[PDB]
Paper text:
Here, we identify an evolutionarily conserved hexapeptide sequence as the major aggregation-prone region (APR) of gastrointestinal peptides of the glucagon family: xFxxWL. We determine nine polymorphic crystal structures of the APR segments of glucagon-like peptides 1 and 2, and exendin and its derivatives. We propose that the pH-dependent changes of the protonation states of glutamate/aspartate residues of APRs initiate switching between the amyloid and the folded, monomeric forms of the hormones. Our results highlight the dual role of short aggregation core motifs in reversible amyloid formation and receptor binding.
Two polymorphic crystal forms could be grown from solutions of APRex-4. In the case of polymorph A, side chains presented an unusually high degree of flexibility. Side chains of Phe2 and the partially disordered side chain of Trp5 assembled into an aromatic cluster near the solvent channel and chain termini. The hydrophobic core is formed by Leu1 and Leu6 while intrasheet H-bonds of Glu-Glu side chains stabilize the interface. The weak residual electron density around the side chains of Trp5 suggests that additional conformers of this side chain are also present in the otherwise close-packed crystals. Tryptophan of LFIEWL (polymorph A) adopts different conformational states, (opaque and transparent side chains) having multiple geometries of aromatic interactions. An aromatic cluster is formed in both polymorphs of APRex-4. However, the exact geometry of the cluster in polymorph A is ambiguous due to the elevated internal mobility of the Trp side chain. At pHs where Glu/Asp side chains become protonated, charge frustration ceases as side chains establish intersheet H-bonds. For example, protonated Glu forms H-bond either with the opposing Glu (S1 of polymorph A, S3 of Polymorph B in APRex-4 Fig. 6c), or with the indole rings of Trp(s) (S2 of Polymorph B Fig. 4e). In the presence of organic solvents, the exendin-like structures adopted more compact crystal forms, in which opposing side chains of the steric zippers interact with each other.
Author numbering: 1 to 6
The structure:
Amino acid sequence: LFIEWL
């Protein structure tokens, strides 16, 4: 599981 916010 991977999550990124930028």
